[PDB]
Amino acid sequence: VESKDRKANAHFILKLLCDSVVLQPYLRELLSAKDARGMTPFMSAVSGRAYPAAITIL
Amino acid sequence: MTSIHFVVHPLPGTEDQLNDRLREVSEKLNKYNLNSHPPLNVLEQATIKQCVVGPNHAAFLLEDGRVCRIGFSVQPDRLSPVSLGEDLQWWPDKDGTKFICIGALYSELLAVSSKGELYQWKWSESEP
Amino acid sequence: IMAVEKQTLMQHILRCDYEACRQYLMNLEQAVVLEQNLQMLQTFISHRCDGNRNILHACVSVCFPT
Question: Which candidate in A19, A35, A55 is best for mutational testing of the C interface (most C CBs within 10 A)?
Answer without folding.
Answer: A35
